Amino acid sequence: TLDRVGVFAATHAAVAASDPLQARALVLQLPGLNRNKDVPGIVGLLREFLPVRGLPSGWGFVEAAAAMRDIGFFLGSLKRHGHEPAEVVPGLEPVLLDLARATNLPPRETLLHVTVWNPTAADAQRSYTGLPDEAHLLESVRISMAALEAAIALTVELFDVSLRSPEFAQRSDELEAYLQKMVESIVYAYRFISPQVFYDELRPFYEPIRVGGQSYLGPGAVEMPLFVLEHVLWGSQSDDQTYREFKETYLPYVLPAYRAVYARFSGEPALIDRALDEARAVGTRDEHVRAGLTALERVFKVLLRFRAPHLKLAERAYEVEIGSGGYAPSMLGELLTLTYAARSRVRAAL
Ligand code: HEM
Ligand SMILES: N[C@@H](Cc1c[nH]c2ccccc12)C(=O)O
Ligand SMILES: [C-]#N
């Protein structure tokens, strides 16, 4: 059914299969050291594979991304024990900045590095803690990432489709089907991840670190480019400053291509503004307009089926303080309000 996922999953698998620093067996030793809070041992382990002579000249994006992944788990870990990794590992910060340059991404690990770029096998998967709850957490993101990327592409495609065309209803139906994966992610997370273990044992690994005279956020599903999708779909012309700050916050953490998608659509009418202006000019007596708007309403419905239970998941965890993305769960309530208002505009048009 979801025939567009494959190419995205294949691009991730290429980084997941890469071990350019031959660090697999070394990184597996990291959970035990974290459990023991052995900060010197964590540093010594990292130094067994950290490049000291600069990056190998034949590396491409894949090798540099994979190297950032493997060094990256040591970054969150060190900070978890109360230490800036750059301050306790000499020669580390230049390597992190060279990897940022090679990948056009920040100089630490992101969500991409620790989930879809991270091999899945028990004898290869990297992890801060080695806990089952961390494994399910990574899996919850693997469920929807590739499908979300397909959904961004469909949203961009749909933006150039006329509401008068039968293609509009068909593309929106397809979009809705990919976005359903976000719902499946939250259902999985609610079923398999203990909020207690998350807050007490996992959350401490996602604090910010200082590199290059600024602060970089730790990994979190908040870095998934859903905000880019919705910037295009409904939020590009929003005048809510809190919302605009939220989106701009995560922009550095998404793939370069999605920063460029975001830039392309900023300060211009969102898909739904255009769709709704078209509906107003042409009338809902046009059968394709009616079907298009109905299909579009189902897209917002699925966004809400993600967002509302995600808010409960988040509050239940903070029922045991802000996320790794730097927000309290109250900002989640604000984004939900905006999403309901966007859906309401669509349903009022019908
Ligand atoms: C126990 C698991 C989770 C907790 C406690 C949690 C909590 C949070 C928090 C506190 C935020 C605000 C940003 C921050 O400060 O980090 C956030 C944002 C966000 N999270 Fe989660 N989250 C969890 C799992 C997930 C999962 C599994 C997904 C999807 C695969 C997800 C997707 C998002 C998205 C897309 C945002 C941006 C806000 C939005 O789109 O509504 N989260 N989450
Ligand atoms: N950002 C949320 C949840 C989170 C942290 N790290 C993650 C990694 C993957 C998925 C979700 C998360 C928090 O800090 O509470
Ligand atoms: C959700 N981070």
Domain ranges of the chain: 1-115, 131-350
Which residues approach ligand 3 with their CB closer than 6 A? 220-222, 323-325
C-beta separation of 250 from 227 below 8 A: yes
Q: In CATH terms, are 1-115 and 131-350 the same topology? A: yes
CB atoms within 10 A of CB 280: 11
* CATH numeric code, 1-115: 1.20.58.1320
Which has the closest alpha carbon to 258: 145, 334, 142, 102?
145
C-beta separation of 335 from 308 below 8 A: no
Cα 168–chain centre separation: 27
| Alpha-carbon gap, residue 292 to 298, rounded angstroms | 10
CB 324 near ligand 2, within 6 Å: yes
Q: By what technique were these coordinates determined?
A: X-ray
CB 233 near ligand 2, within 6 Å: no
| Alpha-carbon gap, residue 235 to 248, rounded angstroms | 12
CB 325 near ligand 1, within 6 Å: yes
- Neighbouring-strand partners of residue 211: 214
Query: What's the one-letter identity of residue 47?
Result: R
Residues placed in the known binding site: 219-222, 310, 318, 324
Give the sign of the dihedral formed by CA 289, CA 240, CA 146, CA 191: negative
Instruction: Considering the domain delimited by 131-350, tell me its CATH architecture.
Output: Up-down Bundle (1.20)
Alpha helices (H) in the chain, listed in sequence order: 5-16, 24-27, 30-35, 39-47, 61-80, 85-88, 92-103, 111-114, 132-159, 166-192, 195-197, 226-230, 241-250, 256-265, 271-282, 287-318, 330-348
Question: Distances in Å between the alpha carbon of 61 and those of 20, 50, 120, 152, 317?
Answer: 11, 18, 20, 22, 35
Resolution (A): 2.2
Which position has the token pair 């290059």? 212
Calculate the CA dihedral of residues 190, 196, 198, 202 and round it to 10 degrees.
-170
DSSP annotation string for 126-194:
--SS--HHHHHHHHHHHHHHHHHHHHHHHHHHHHTS-TTSHHHHHHHHHHHHHHHHHHHHHHHHHHH--
Give the sign of the dihedral formed by CA 315, CA 112, CA 262, CA 172: negative
